[model samples]
Target chain A: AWPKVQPEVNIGVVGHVDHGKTTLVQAITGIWTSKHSEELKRGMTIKLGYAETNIGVCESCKKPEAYVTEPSCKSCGSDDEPKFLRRISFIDAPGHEVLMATMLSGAALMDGAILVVAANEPFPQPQTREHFVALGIIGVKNLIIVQNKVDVVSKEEALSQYRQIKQFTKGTWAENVPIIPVSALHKINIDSLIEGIEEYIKTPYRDLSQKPVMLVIRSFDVNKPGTQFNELKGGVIGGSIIQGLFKVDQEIKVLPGLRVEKQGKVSYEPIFTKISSIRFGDEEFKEAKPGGLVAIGTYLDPSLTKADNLLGSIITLADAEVPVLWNIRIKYNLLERVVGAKEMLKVDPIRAKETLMLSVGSSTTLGIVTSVKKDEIEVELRRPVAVWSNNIRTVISRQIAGRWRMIGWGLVEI
Target chain B: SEKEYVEMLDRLYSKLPEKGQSLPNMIILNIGNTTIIRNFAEYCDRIRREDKICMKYLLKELAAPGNVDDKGELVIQGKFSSQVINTLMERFLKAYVECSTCKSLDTILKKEKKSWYIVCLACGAQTPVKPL
Candidate 1:
């Protein structure tokens, strides 16, 4: 028997590099989703962290990982127990201008944000302000400021930084944000952050009425000794399960390609896997309700999969078309230091054209702007991307020249 | 006011070169900072793209007496003598201009140049209003 649960709202922790976004997530959820090689050596998140709240049974197979995936927790031992976890999703971005293009790759998928600022530092750094400006343009209205690294800085220093943050919030929705100071190392003030989320974020119930839409953020194929031979293996796509319940044996469409597949973003469909069965230290549900952070499987082989492809929901071409717009407005911290980095748009060794790589939430893609304006731009993504209405926000690293900084963001207009 | 403008159009139409004739596609190539050259280049490209006759660029020169208006339009005194323009009309009757900014093209050569040099009525870049 499982406990009845309400739908979950996904929230992401973002900031300039080394602002403790990954550490804060580890502190709040006790999950170490950071994958930086340095973090592995230093035993802490150093850069580009990734993870989502333990949600429903394997969106694909519904199996449980007996061992914990995160290093923060040794064992929760809550296997077979359907934990009512809040579906908090996060995008850990790199904090360097050179990596700014890579930062734009994943930052597009996140809806809500945690602006993690280091408490002891002077006011917001340049990238910190740029991140906030990018988020503000993207329209991520809900923001929670995490004054991290309080262990080293005095409370007065944190307050001063907060005051500086207030200056950036003038005339913006981030003005109403609640800042919580925490020591990810000491594990302080995390409860306050969670409590703030519970108060400000009213998680919506998954509406079975709407079509299931998934904005794929991250994808990779997990190869293991399998009963089936290695064919065109499916990719693991993470994003919000926008509407309806994800259940076993559900036949779904992978849009842009429009191929039908019988698997969730993370596993093969039909059997439900417990959080313990899939990844330890995380909880699982039989079916992920709407608005919950989720992952699903795609029909294309792993080689064919690219970031920006939608996992669920396929509208007729008569209904909609691919997006190409520049400026979009979203709310987020402009001056808070968080995790981010910059990478040049890579040249397709074969295609021989420049590409803009965008990162938001768990998705990344190579995008090309067909039309551009100071505030708005239209992009023709090289691949099919799954982003919600006004959900895809972009920031550029002036990568065109050596002078790299946040360019601006735009949304997908119908 | 409307009547006066209509009269100007009628006079201008009478001076227009014969249709179906090959014309110089005066491509106003912008070499540098000179605004006249830029506008001339744009003006020519536009006219050439639409015109039936083939257009060509002769030469671009800065006129000491020519002054550009606030809109970057040039006004030249004695731009081209009529006889030299007619000589140009022997090869091509139409003249178009090319501009750097806005990539605009314009047509300005009139048949009076057929007696002399063809002056770009658009940018004042001229060889002496010429006629074919």
Candidate 2:
């Protein structure tokens, strides 16, 4: 059992379908987020695409398909591994509400987030913008507001919309927030957004110094096991490292106290009984850090982690409270979109219930209260991901008269 | 007690001393998998064992299904007798039902059909019972 290292960071990209979320990431990571050939032909991102640019293993290992024998490319087989990787992992979340649970799945695991909103189309699209509000709910503070699609709108219009954007984010974390007007389609503010993200990267975070804890977002086994049914082949568990470092030969505990060891393990029988070893990136980093995406090697018997609840750093701090609920209106990224009155929109947990999703920084489950006397309704979320209730923007979209219209925006409070 | 579930009725009116809002014909649509309805009931039953909903008063309106689910609703329609409008409101919010889509509770309560249907619209869950 030797010591290896795999360090990574988890970033969540959120916005409406065509607001350039996947495109923006592709521009930065130089990898397409689209999967389908048809989508590639049209230069559009349809399904989800995960692109990792680390010096070592292939980004595919960090995805839902980590069970394959050659999840990582052969380049990492030798010790000549790459150093810094610009991996673009895309989570395709619909601006629509019915598909909210899927979007939340992506939002929960993100340590950092990029709010992609096209400025040319309109100031706020309900679906895209509300997600911005959702970021706040989930406690996502490291954000960069990309006023995407500025190429289409006149600078005056964009500025005016920016002003309108200010109005939209009146009291939330987005109020007076740093807004970089760029066009994901034109590759305008990509670099600026990246620079902004790096500036906020060094903020305080949960410590992962001890306790090998890993959140299993995805898991897979590549090859078949040995005849013993105990000699499980190589498998990978993908998720963000909440706290502590995970080593190659170290033994870790799985849920319900299932212990996994890499060094001198008796048998892989019931692979769950004990894992073979740890393989991070393709190279076998025995050690990893917190707040980064990682894959682990287990006894390749079967997969375990599915839902988000299964993954999360066991050592990470429990949810903490931040006194920042400011009253403001959250503008809808798509003004014409119609969001339902009460659809159980959840911004994870520990957030208001009525915030909307708009084109801003992240994906959220908040919406505008369309019919309340004050033209507002209450907001509630399932988890506190991270957005200052005081200044946040959320996009909202709904089935208006049967024709899913992206409509009006509102502030988080006020 | 029953008061909490009853508060789920139309008690928000009292809270909104500014402008009293009526039940506006609402039905609590318990769709798919939900624990809020059951939780509210537990709160009510824990507070008061009496099936009598009036006991819910202490549990306060916050104990209402609408409050718990963030979209307060619970269908108590049974096409039956002449209970006062307020009493009916109390029953609808507190009394819980599992099957909202295919249920005969509305069919049996023919008299309350009109109001129950309206409440369903207000609550945004389409119950099987239609306007009479």
Candidate 3:
């Protein structure tokens, strides 16, 4: 009933506010990322937006046409479908400077990226530079810069902006990256952008042998309020299985699950529950593999998972020994300058009693400096982080100018 | 007759501080560049329900620099990170929301004579709590 079984891979579109990241995603997938009423009212993406599209080749023109949510080809107007290539899941991250945590969380789920830059605007905005540094800190090396809004600017201006992009990306991970100029609004050069993605953004190799691990990006109660008791459904969690595979009816455990008190000290215990169903898009499957986004139905109370309350949690096989950490020590490094700041102030040392926001996988929590060493510092988290391995990549950000700006990242010394 | 007298005392004690009052919405909104809790009264009232205390009592316990706004929302002054606010909120939940006997949030603080008891709505366990 569906198109060919195109293997799914996640690619993120990240940029500054109004830089047209959402528009670019829509051009590729025809599904606007900002579908929420609040995001629509605010005129920006408030949360991570995901949509999948198949990049198929038109037989007549021999060019790629985005088989977006719509059926036929947009290029040749052919009623017949093109040969299916790959199913691309685009993660449209919010571009607001104030929503850096949301952006960072989105970045954790990405394997590669398409850094959107507007050709009509100047080279790099504050959020533009911050996003570049964030991608580097998050270890997303595979990047392709999309110079959008080419239709708004003259050829000379577009070329000049392209030069600026080259100058900006020099000496970075994206140094040798390809820059595809396209007008996402008008669908100009979209085929070339798709070509760049297919050739450059190769899907990272996944290991199915390892234990299954999933980062809980969102959890919600899908049942309507007035639904009959017999028709009531369990909670649903939406995210990507980063490792291994998940099968329906498989018993899974959510770490740092529920708050508990033992000997006057508050801690969390693992929540063990069975998976009711797994869905990828509209298709239901008995088992799910690690790749694109997935929604898992579980037999948990709806109130417990409502309003993204269980967000940033980790899910794994039942009885698996996941790391529940409250204190962490790591040798860290800071950027030469603080990102998202106008003046680009030099990063200061982590002082005692200073509070910082720490993000691992999709989880973001606040940490306080408990002990400061010459190279390594120790922090006590108010909330625990659920990690699978000892060598976890962690992002540390300090609150600067009312926004939690990313400063550095490091490896947790278990 | 003795059990009837005890029940009467409990009812009067519970009625002394309004029971089943709706909690204030969690603080949202930023004044200029600073974060402010616009509904301080409700938050304090909700906390008081569990602590069996008053707003001033909890404020003193938190000891965070803040003032009650004209709108009755708690306006926390200075640069207090979200971590600080969350820590305070957790402390409030532990002291007030959670049941000591069953650890369930569905519980109410009932007073009899000079002593206080946490009446669990879920497990029906009654445990003593310290007075504010």
Candidate 4:
């Protein structure tokens, strides 16, 4: 039977590119990722890569064999009467070196992470270190390590790589994390992987009384070729809810919406729309709450949201307090040495009149540093943003070697 | 008693209005009400059915009859005319119900802190609204 429930816990798959992250997700979720990224790269719609899976556990079986994706237990099958456990959402964090901003935005949605490392390769690639530190910056809790591609390598080489991983993770947030050697290609030791997931990551407490604020990450039109008038639905907005609850048929507003020309100058205005439907799994939902990624069906125009045009907006109730700021002052702290680049480059002083990429919450926009006084700087944003919450971290990056690299971070107190 | 009344009248005349200094019924909104609007519930129900999904804001506004009561009848507040009340109703619609940009009636007033705005569902426009 199909269930109408959604997974409340968001887990991030963090690693270097070509390290079996997507394959590992397919091994666990029975679904593939990055094929969508293929479309996103070449004249197609982009999505925040994520997949959901329902885990099952048999009470009689041992810890490793007890956990499975199948409804029935693998060790004893359905005869032993396996039961359903919680559902999990795996967010595929992009491992490309230049896409740190995109990864940073997605990290804002994760509750925990599974760091993937290729067993046959050397320890801690440049992107692996970058992604690991990015998680630390985002303050994502509950860590698990995956030593993948173990099937392709010899047992001694796998043991050697495990020692390398331990050395690389020493004195860090992942120092004590459980490392499981998984051959995602052949589904080897995936039972151990499942057990690690269940043991390490527990769902945290969520408050439903706070005003619901959803970061709009991906949006698209739900229409197809030659669609009938009565059968047509509105644009669908998709993202993870950070707080509060959104009910079906509720009146919600999108902050810092489309930019408009007024008096021969540009400014942004918020949009008002009602939630026509809330989608979870294969069925409609009465309400959506924090802890999961949910899609909202609205009456917005196809032109407004086609090809993810409405991405990076804020969604909340009409009366929620969200500020639209065009100018921001950030007190920053630059990193001693930048990650991602093979050459360890030291971060220099922020100069005035330099254009830097600033990402906060799920919004990534360019800001011109108008003034730099000691550790503080003022920036004029290229577009307006609606930052509702206080003390949101601002990830700052500078352009180097023709690719944007994260230099430091700051806090914007409102 | 007659001489005392004469002295009071002279003092009042001394504090008389200047030649061009004037405040009239239009500026002062001096319209008063003595008549009762009996079909109050029916008027609100018409608005409820006519508007798509919002009358909660307007119902609360009307009850506050912009100071409407629970009774089907609204008691007299001032000695105002039927035309004056009708004009007041039109102003309320323009301020709260109708969208100024799209000229559509599919709008509801929203608030942020102490400010109010007329947000249009048809055109997605959010315009400010003046308080009573």
- Output per-candidate TM-scores for chain A, rounded to 2 decimals: 0.63, 0.57, 0.93, 0.94
Ranking by TM-score: 4, 3, 1, 2
lDDT of 1 by residue, A291-410 (tens): 434545434454433433333222111223333223223221122222222342332221213345444433444566454444444555544444444544444332445444444334
Model 3 RMSD in Å is 24.9
In candidate 3, the second chain superimposes onto the true chain B with a TM-score of 0.56
Tell me each candidate's RMSD, in Å, in order: 29.1, 25.6, 24.9, 31.3
Candidate 3 C-alpha lDDT tens digits along A69-96: 3445666676566666667788888888
Q: Candidate 2: list runs displaced more than 4 Å.
A: A1-8, A34-49, A53-96, A203-206, A209-212, A224-234, A256-275, A303-414, B1-132
In model 3, the runs with Cα more than 4 Å from the true position are A1-7, A39-46, A64-74, A77-81, B1-132
Model 3 CAPRI quality: incorrect
Error of 4 at A311 (Å): 0.7
- Candidate 1: residue A404 Cα off by (Å): 4.9
Regions more than 4 Å wrong, model 4: A1-3, A34-37, A40-44, A74-78, B1-132
lDDT of 4 by residue, A1-414 (tens): 324467868898889888988778877887766523446321124334778888878887766657777665646544576677788888877788877778888888888989999877778887888888888877876988888875555555766676677777778877777777776765666777887888899877888888889987877777887999888888888887888789988888887987898889898878888988887656578888766677898888866776777777888897878888988878887887779888997987899999999988778899899989888888988888788777677888999889988888887756
Give residue A3's lDDT in candidate 1 (0 to 100).
Answer: 32
Worst 10-residue lDDT window, candidate 2 chain A:
A62-71
Model number with the top lDDT = 3
Worst 10 residues of 4 chain A by lDDT: A35-44
Tens-place lDDT per residue, model 2, A216-242, is 445555444454654545444565555
TM-score of 3: 0.72
Residue A254's C-alpha lDDT in candidate 2? Answer: 43
Question: Which parts of model 1 have CA positions greater than 4 angstroms off?
Answer: A1-7, A38-91, A204-208, A226-236, A243-246, A258-287, A290-293, A298-397, A411-413, B1-132
Q: Candidate 3 at A292: error in angstroms?
A: 2.3
Q: Which ten residues in a row have the lowest lDDT in candidate 3 chain A?
A: A35-44
Model 1 chain A poorest 10 in a row by lDDT: A272-281
User: How much lDDT does each candidate structure score?
Assistant: 0.45, 0.43, 0.74, 0.72
Q: How close is every model to the real structure, measured as TM-score? A: 0.50, 0.45, 0.72, 0.72
